[PDB]
Structure formats: structure tokens, C-alpha cells
Amino acid sequence: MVLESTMVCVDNSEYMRNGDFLPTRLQAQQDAVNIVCHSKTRSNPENNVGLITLANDCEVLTTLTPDTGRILSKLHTVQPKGKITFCTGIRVAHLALKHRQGKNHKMRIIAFVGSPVEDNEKDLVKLAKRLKKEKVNVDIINFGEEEVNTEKLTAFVNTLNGKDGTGSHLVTVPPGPSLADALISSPILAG
Amino acid sequence: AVDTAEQVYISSLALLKMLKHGRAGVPMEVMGLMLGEFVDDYTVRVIDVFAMPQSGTGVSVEAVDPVFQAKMLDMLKQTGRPEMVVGWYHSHPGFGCWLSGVDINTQQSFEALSERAVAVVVDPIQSVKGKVVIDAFRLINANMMVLGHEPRQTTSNLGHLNKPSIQALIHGLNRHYYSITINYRKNELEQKMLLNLHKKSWMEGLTLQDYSEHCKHNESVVKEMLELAKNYNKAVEEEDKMTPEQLAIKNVGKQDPKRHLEEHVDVLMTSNIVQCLAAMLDTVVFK
Amino acid sequence: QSRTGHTHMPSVVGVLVFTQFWFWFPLSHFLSLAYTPTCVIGLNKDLKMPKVQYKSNCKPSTFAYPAPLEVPSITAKAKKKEKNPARVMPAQLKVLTMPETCRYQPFKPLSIGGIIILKDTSEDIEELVEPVAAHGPKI
Ligand SMILES: [Zn+2]
16 A cells, blocks of 8 residues: 655644634644544555644654554643744654654655744745755645735745655645535545 | 584673563563574674563463564664564572473474574572573484484583583483573773773762761771770780790691781781871872 | 704694684694604705615614504614604704715715705715605505
């Protein structure tokens, strides 16, 4: 089947409980993690899935393991503190990819971004140059917005996305009362 | 049909793990597994050694859990321990280091994969703290009874293998059960780290703390040991007053096993602490 | 060492490797490299073998061979002939005395044992040439 590692980064800021969008969509994207981890489990049960947030003091909630029975429990007690942290959020997983058991598992990291990015374009091109340098599959998922959706993140992805053939895809969700599961499951990354 | 001269390399890892495992070597039967790498035919090196949980059955093939063994071995494979198992060890308290029928049966069953199958039995219960001499065991082929027992070359090290010369176990059960020599190895990092670590383990923190303690205890506590030392000195001189009579009568042969000389030399050595520490007080007072 | 006092390299190598049998016993086979037979050489020509017979100032029975069990005051001349010179002790090199009636005599006075040649003093017929052996255990 498919031998690859899955890393998800969820936001724990207070920007995920606003009443305009879904009713505390944290549970909705939790069900998204559930359907992508159970979908990858149905495709290849040997894939390991890690859990970590993007707070100031990043904490590894669950080590990379195919056993999601305790991951379902670890998805709770999100500790809604902090706002956003991007640099050590990338470096806390992309550098931790070397701690996986199976060396044949490809590198794939996703992230749920629910807060505006605090890093300037220089950090975007330095981190995009680092991720394109080490050649890690990066899927950017941006939930919620305050300013325009993609102004510098467009060039961030275009400069970050190498290997144009069957490479990485960008997930941009527009506002809407519909669920996010079917909207993020539309690309080829899910399934 | 070929045999060589093998020798088991023993580092301080397996040694200290067999010493902590010997401290945990309760009368109940215990289990352990040795790891390492096979580079050639006649050498074997052990690096990784861990313990196993005890069971009411004791040493047996049923107590060895293959999912637990393979689980811990896999957790060692995901870490920086890419070594395969090389043997299993245990403890035989009281009844001697020899191997019973169950031990030779689980050894026969565990030797199907590894042709060497190194077996070590540690027994620190009745062994004195002066020597920690340990011996490794081997299994001989039952079909070699017609030919020579052990066609092992380099018969020089057998003199070093003759140190366990108990007159009941080695040749009391030597039939179908022999042993192998053991050597050690120590690099410069273990030599300087463990050497300076032991010297520091016998030294002080700043190394200047407990010096003045004795330099100034020479005036308070050692004075009692000096007066008692003079009490033993006079307590021998009261007999040394009678010695020149016998020495003035017989002069032939010695009947008293006491020398009366080296003990007083040792008393002088304990008395020279005042002289050696007087310069220390001179340095502390000076600067 | 040699006769001139210099030491032989394959003798020292052979004896040290001979002492190296402790770690590896088959290494003792290099002892044959240190075997130095003690004898004399009176070979005059490369293809002609003469016969030199000297005499010793000691007793011949004292220099005989210690013949073991079966288990089923001066000699007239030495036993070295056709030169088959036998063993000779280094202390025996001072008691040898060449005969004055010997037909042949080298140019150098034979004082100590070693490798020397023979000088034809007569330079006449009857050099007493002896034949060579034949095929067998050797070539
Ligand atoms: Zn027992």
C-alpha cells in the first residue's frame, strides 16, 4: 500500500470558538482528523499519526503510532491557550520526522491554521526554502481568516511547492455554514 | 564438521548489568537476554544486556514471551541498538552454577537459531566480595562422543580456564557440559572516566574540605588514638622486657608467631600523619 | 651468531617466532630457519670432492653419540672424511691439529671452524674423486 508518515498540527487559540462560523469547529476538524486517520487506517493500517499543537510552548501530545485508540482520547483537553507559533511549529515536526520507526515511510505533514501568521515574508521564504530544500510534502490548510485569505501565502506555496508533477496541493476553504470535512476531502490528499 | 577456538568478550556493560541483576538475584529463578554482533567465527562480543520480569514458573521456555521479547528488541531496533540477541543468562543460587535438565532443554531449544548460544550464570550469593570471577557455559554436540570431545586449538588459555577448579562441578559434571574462556576489554574513555570517577569516588568535592578536618582532629581525637597507641606500645614492651632473657638463654629456633616489629612499624605509619599534616597546617596558615 | 661474531637474522626471527607459539601453536614451524649445522668444509673445487682427515687432541669416546637403549687417551685421526663431517662443539675447535703428513693443505691456517677451501699442494694425478649419490628420498 502507501507507506508514509502523517503529522497534523491543530490550533489551540481562542479564534476557534467564534459564533459566526461552525459551533466550535474544533470538534469538526477533530472529526476531520478522525476520518483521515480512519481513512488512512483503511488504506494502510501501518501508517503512524502524530499530534501536536502550534502554541508557544509546543508539546508532543502523542508519538507517531498507528494505534489511534488512545489518540482519540488525546484529542481532548486541548488546553486553549496561546495564539499562534509558526517557526517552532514547523521545526517541531519537520525536524522530528527522523524519529519515526519505519524509515521507508514518506514524509507528509499537514497543519490546521486558525490564526493570522505573525511571521514576515522573510521567514516565509526562509522556511519555504528549508522545506523545499529537505523535500517534505507540506499541505497548508487555513481555517478562518481576518484579512484576505491568500496574499503572501500564494507566493509562499508557489515557492514552497516543488516537484510540480503530482506534488503538494493547497487547501483554501471559503466561508460557509457547511462542514469542512467534505471540503477538505475534495483534493487527492484525503484517500 | 569443523571447530575453532572461541573466546567471549565481556565489557563493563554486561558485567555491571549482571551485578545489578545479581543484586536483584533473589532465590527465585530469573531470566535475562544478551545481545551483540557476530563478526567472525571464533569471536563473540556482547554489548546490550537487560533483565526480564520474574515468574512463578522460573527459568523455562514458556516464561519467554515472544511478543515481549520481540517488542523490546524492536524498541531497541528503532533506537541506536542495531544488535541481535547472542544468548541468555540467569542465576543459580545455592545449588551451584551447574545447569539442570530444564536449563539444558531450553538451551537446546534456544540454540537452534544461534550456533554459538553463549550461556552465562552469575552467582554472587555465596561468592565473596574479593573475587567476581564469572564463567561462561557452552553446549556440546551429542554426536561428538565418538570423536574427541573438544577439538579446540590454542590450548594456552586453558591454564586461565583452570581457575574454576572445583572438584565436584567442573569435572564432577564435565561430561556433555564444558565451558569457555573469558577476557575483558577497556578503551581509554572507560579507563579515564571510570578511573577518575573512582578516584573522585574516594576523593572530596573540592578536595580541600576534609584535609583540615583531620589536620585539626590530630589535636582533639587522634590524641586519644596516640595515647592508646602508646598503651599498646608499652603493652608489648612489657613482654619485650622478658624477651632478652629467652634470647639470652636459647637463641635457637622461634616459637612465638608474633613478630613485634611490623605492628610497631604500622603504629609509626599511623603516627606519621601528624608529621605529614603539619606541613598542611603550615600551608593553610601561610596562604 | 655467526663465526665472525655477527648475528643471523633468520636465526633471531626463527627463535622469536618459535617463542610466539603461545598464541598460535602452528607458528613453531619457523624453527627450521634457525638450524645451523656445525661442521667443516674442505671443498677445493666445485665438482671435485677431496678427503681431509685431521686428528683431535681429546678422547674419541668422550665425543661419541649417546646411543639410547635397544628397546626391540687420544685418537689417531678424526671421523670426518670425504670432505661427511659430523657434529662439532665450538670448544672442539681449539683442540684440532692438522696432520703434517697430509698430502693436501689449504693456504689459510685452519684455526677456527668455518667455511674454507682446500689448496692442491701436490698438483699431480690421483686427486681421489668420489662419485655422487642417486635417486631416493631426495632428488
Ligand atoms: Zn533452583
